[PDB]
Design a protein around this ligand. Structure first.
Ligand SMILES: C=C1C[C@]23CC[C@H]1C[C@H]2[C@]1(C)CCC[C@@](C)(C(=O)SCCNC(=O)CCNC(=O)[C@H](O)C(C)(C)COP(=O)(O)O)[C@H]1C[C@H]3O
Ligand SMILES: [Mn+2]
Ligand SMILES: [Mn+2]
Ligand SMILES: [Mn+2]
Ligand SMILES: [Mn+2]
Ligand SMILES: [Mn+2]
Lengths: 356, 356
């Protein structure tokens, strides 16, 4: 009771520099994501493409020792008063901008085996997101099925899929089925599948942070409007790291178009966009007070807190100071929904007593 | 079963077919916007370009008489219970996709002259939005000042500005300064400027209605992050026809970036993005319940209601029934703020006679 015990729907693991070096067949090794550290600069390379350049200050700001040592991660969880934590890739996210299905498939296979055998094995508190090919449905289905057998509870998809593979297209249907069948949550994490540095004028850093929402919103719109959620009532989707309050907003906007633009709408839905969102679309946030508002005043109950451990955008190391001010004066049942119960609906971890 | 007086922050006027033909030199008059309704299709010509080619339901997408007859429209106000109403262009919006600064400047003049002479003359319950050039700053300032001497209260800007004229750019500063001086509200209406992203697959109607939000969210982010509003505390902005609940969501999103990515953030603001949003950014809606949650639960008081007469996505003929459903068991001080007082803070109309 001397801490508020949280479940985090969002965090990242830094992969071993040599993950793909050691594990891939030799024909693919050089093409895997690798990095050069020189001057103040870390340049990431993927399959003959510079994909990212950061200064070492910011690169290493996201690299506290818990981001590397999984034994320190757990000590940081305890320290933050965090129990459950979903873990998303860092380096493996660049699989989502690969143009070669074979390279992407094999890199993903390597990541999924490492994450389960060398990280998730340390504690049942850690729930892992398995990657699945953004490029080929048969590769993604095969990997999700293989990941389920291994006991994975959720797959990661990039917010921006490859060209012609928008989330409303038929190509995704076999994956939505497999995911529904397997009981498996689809986690779409923002800032992935495309270049995140879109704006370069005055206000660039705030503009770009905003630009990452558009694919998230687009993704919900494509999954609702296409009927994908409607055909798969068991399929539940987590928009991770997008904030929350835009989700009921978008529920209203798709309802207006469904009702007033009825005559141009294809396909028809068994219920309204708003109902599909409120049933099956979850979303995570770190600091956003609007996230409570969406629950109390907009009937959007699918809100989950996340540390985004250990990015700057996240709460670490001030998790307790942050959640304490957010939920200062807030109904205990809503603090519990947002911080604990929505998590345990999506993900299985050992149950804290809700009594303590 | 009694009605209630509302102000409306969004509606449109259909300009005369011959509007620019009759008023422009030879070098010009053939290149101004031409709508053509024929064979179940709506086609729009601008400066040699087909800028739209949309299907029409010759059955269930039929236009209200009052769009086609400006005296049937004022009857439609009285019937719908609407006192003040902001009026935006229809065909005139096409000046914002124009590439020729001369065609744009001169069409804007023809429009601002006509709308005052022949439409706003009908009733001072009408608040006209004057167009100003999206292409040249000197020409945008000229026409704003001219429109102000003419008594215009607000200038229309397109959501998507021309390439290289993003709203974070220094090219707009003269126009912001002039808008503040003039005491003129800046109204950014959505679904205007060069068509950004058209979706083509399943759910296209619903996806395309969501797509038009992104230019608006982007526009607010550009104006907040760039210091435009911070440097101009008397400049006010209305986002017309985008809904509302995403605005506090975007305040939070921008505060997370401002606080957690302070090192990347240029320029600095005198107060947080969310403060500038809550102080200077207004947003309109027609049907969206979340618009009330934004006021009651997210401390966003800059919500206005609009009819969006005569568009399908508007409330006609059910304005009163819609507004009755929305405000059922809602503090009438909030009904008053959203339906009347925000309107009278932005706009001047004749005093509404008291009832009982
Ligand atoms: C492990 C990673 C994954 C990922 C990409 C590389 C790293 C890390 C994160 C990060 C990126 C982590 C911040 C969250 C998130 C979701 C974003 O995308 S936030 C948007 C990007 N923000 C930034 O790059 C930092 C702010 N800086 C900028 O915006 C620009 O560098 C500039 C300030 C405009 C300078 O340009 P210039 O005008 O001076 O020429 C992720 C995406 C994720 O895929
Ligand atoms: Mn994250
Ligand atoms: Mn992050
Ligand atoms: Mn004909
Ligand atoms: Mn409108
Ligand atoms: Mn409209």
């Amino acid at each position: 009771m001397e801490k508020l015990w949280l479940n985090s729907a969002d965090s990242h693991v830094l992969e071993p520099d040599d993950l793909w070096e050691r594990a891939l067949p030799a024909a693919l090794r050089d093409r895997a994501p690798r990095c050069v550290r020189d001057n103040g600069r870390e340049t990431v390379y993927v399959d003959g493409q510079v994909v990212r350049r950061d200064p070492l200050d910011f690169a290493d700001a996201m690299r506290p020792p818990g981001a590397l040592d999984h034994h320190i991660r757990l000590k940081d969880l305890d320290d933050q008063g965090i129990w459950g934590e979903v873990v998303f890739p860092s380096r493996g996210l660049w699989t989502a901008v690969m143009t070669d299905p074979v390279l992407a498939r094999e890199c993903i296979k390597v990541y999924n085996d490492w994450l389960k055998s060398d990280f998730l094995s340390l504690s049942p508190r850690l729930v892992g997101a398995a990657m699945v090919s953004m490029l080929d449905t048969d590769d993604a289905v095969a990997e999700l099925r293989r990941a389920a057998d291994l006991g994975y509870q959720t797959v990661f998809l990039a917010a921006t899929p490859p060209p012609g593979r928008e989330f409303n297209m038929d190509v995704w249907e076999p994956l939505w089925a497999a995911a529904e069948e397997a009981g498996m949550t689809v986690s779409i994490h923002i800032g992935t599948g495309a270049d995140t540095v879109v704006a370069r004028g005055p206000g660039g850093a705030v503009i770009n942070y905003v630009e990452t929402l558009f694919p998230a919103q687009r993704a919900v719109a494509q999954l609702v409007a296409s009927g994908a959620l409607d055909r798969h009532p068991g399929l539940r989707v987590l928009i991770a790291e997008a904030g929350c309050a835009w989700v009921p907003a978008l529920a209203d906007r798709m309802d207006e178009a469904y009702r007033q633009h009825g005559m141009f709408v294809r396909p028809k839905l068994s219920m309204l966009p708003g109902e599909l969102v409120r049933r099956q679309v979850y979303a995570s946030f770190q600091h956003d007070e609007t996230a409570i508002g969406a629950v109390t005043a907009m009937n959007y109950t699918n809100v989950l807190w996340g540390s985004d451990y250990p990015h700057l955008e996240g709460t670490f190391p001030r998790t307790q100071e942050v959640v304490t001010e957010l939920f200062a004066g807030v109904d205990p049942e809503v603090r519990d929904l947002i911080t604990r119960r929505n998590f345990t609906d999506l993900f299985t971890v050992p149950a804290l007593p809700a009594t303590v």
